[PDB]
Amino acid sequence: GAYKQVKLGEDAPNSSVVHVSNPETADGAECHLLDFASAERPLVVNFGSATCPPFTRQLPAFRQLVEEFSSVADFLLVYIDEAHPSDGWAVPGDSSLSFEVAAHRNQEDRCAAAHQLLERFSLPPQCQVVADRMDNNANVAYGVAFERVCIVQRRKIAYLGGKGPFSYNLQEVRSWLEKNFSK
């Protein structure tokens, strides 16, 4: 109504997004989040942007999850609005892991930033990538505060990272996957 609040167990919002080609569908094609979900296979959805350090710091660990589990689970990176958009002048005095991105003007800018991200962090095609639409519908529906992971299973939210200081933890996602595939 006036605000959204998603929780564990609820139906996963079928947000509108745009494909970002990640070759080994047409680049920029419109699609929906649940287009990437299949049978009882978990879909691990990782929301963030290049200027969000908690997100980029764990992108290598995300890549490893994709490598270890893509035969049994699907992976989707949803590129949202920049956490810390650049103004182009100030020089990060520390060498930083990720790269600067200015505030997106349009969908093309957001898709371009996702293309930059995929190259910088060596994400493989099995890590499917989309960009949120410019109305930020996926960001708002999934309650993302700069970065979040949601695992969708059987059309419902099976895992939803919390709001604590260290709630964004891809090794907790690893644990979920280990449990799901264990006897």
Numbering used by the authors: 70 to 93, 103 to 261
Paper text:
Iodothyronine deiodinases (Dio) are selenocysteine-containing membrane enzymes that activate and inactivate the thyroid hormones (TH) through reductive iodide eliminations. The three deiodinase isoforms are homodimers sharing highly conserved amino acid sequences, but they differ in their regioselectivities for the deiodination reaction and regulatory features.
To explore the molecular basis of deiodinase isoform differences, we solved a crystal structure of the catalytic domain of Mus musculus Dio2 (mDio2cat; residues 71–262). The catalytic Sec130 was replaced with cysteine to simplify bacterial overexpression. The protein mDio2cat-(Lys180Ala-Lys181Ala; mDio2cat-AlaAla) indeed formed well-diffracting crystals and the structure of mDio2cat-AlaAla (from now on referred to as mDio2cat) could be solved and refined at a resolution of 1.1 Å to R/Rfree values of 14.5% and 16.9%, respectively. The mDio2cat structure comprises 183 residues, covering an N-terminal Gly as a cloning artifact, a small part of the linker to the transmembrane region (71–76), and the complete catalytic core (77–261), except for the C-terminal Arg262 and residues 94–102, which are not defined by electron density. All residues of the structure are within favored (96.5%) or allowed regions (2.9%) of the Ramachandran plot, except for Phe224, which is well defined by electron density. mDio2cat features a Trx/Prx fold with deiodinase-specific modifications and insertions and high similarity in the overall structure to mDio3cat, confirming the proposed conservation of a Trx/Prx-related fold among the Dio isoforms. A major difference between Dio2 and other isoforms, however, is a 15-residue (91–105) “Dio2-insertion” in the N-terminal region of the catalytic core.
